[PDB]
Structure 1
């Protein structure tokens, strides 16, 4: 019954260093619905992370959108960490501005 989360990390707008933007963590394809999602900046938890209400898809599996305000820079590193019962340990996906 357990279905494993799929994650994309990406910005709302085309990223320009120094211009404020939103960073998204789109988490899909999971079951059961209980999930824990953290957004991280340089390895540290980001406070005040907006979380969409929970929804499910036509295949029954759940999805959720987390986002936060951020200003991209040349060297700041961002990630999304997901804890879920389908995986032994948490999954981290790092923001790649080319993807």
Structure 2
């Protein structure tokens, strides 16, 4: 259900966080470099009745630089509505 791996096998690459089973704004996904959030994370469309998606970011690996993925359930609450006043 969550798996982390590199797109291609010390130069620029992509780091993938594969999520299978999870309903995506139903979810929040962070990619971490040494425990801290990577700024730009992309994600594929849902692909299917199982599904997966991939959250990925471009990265250059270094031997002591470590990477992870954090997945959280998202709950939406307390809407505030503002009408467009023409």
Matched residue of 1:30: which SS? coil
* Counterpart residue number, 1:92: none
Give 5+ residue unaligned stretches, structure 1. Answer: 1-5, 86-99
TM-score after normalising by structure 1: 0.66
- Number of equivalences: 74
From 7, 10, 23, the counterpart of 2:5: 10
Counterpart pick for 1:68 among 51, 57, 63: 57
TM-score in terms of structure 2 length: 0.75
Q: Larger Cα Rg: Structure 1 or Structure 2?
A: 2
1:20 matched to 2:15? no
User: Once the 2 structures are TM-superposed, how far is the Cα of residue 54 of structure 1 from its aligned partner?
Assistant: 3.0
Give the Å deviation of 1:32.
Answer: 7.8
Shift of 1:31: 4.8
Q: Which has the larger share of strand?
A: 2
Please list every run of at least 4 consecutive aligned residues from structure 1 whose deviation after the TM superposition is greater than 4 angstroms: none
Label 1:81 to 1:32 Cα distance change in 2 as closer, same or farther (>3 A): closer
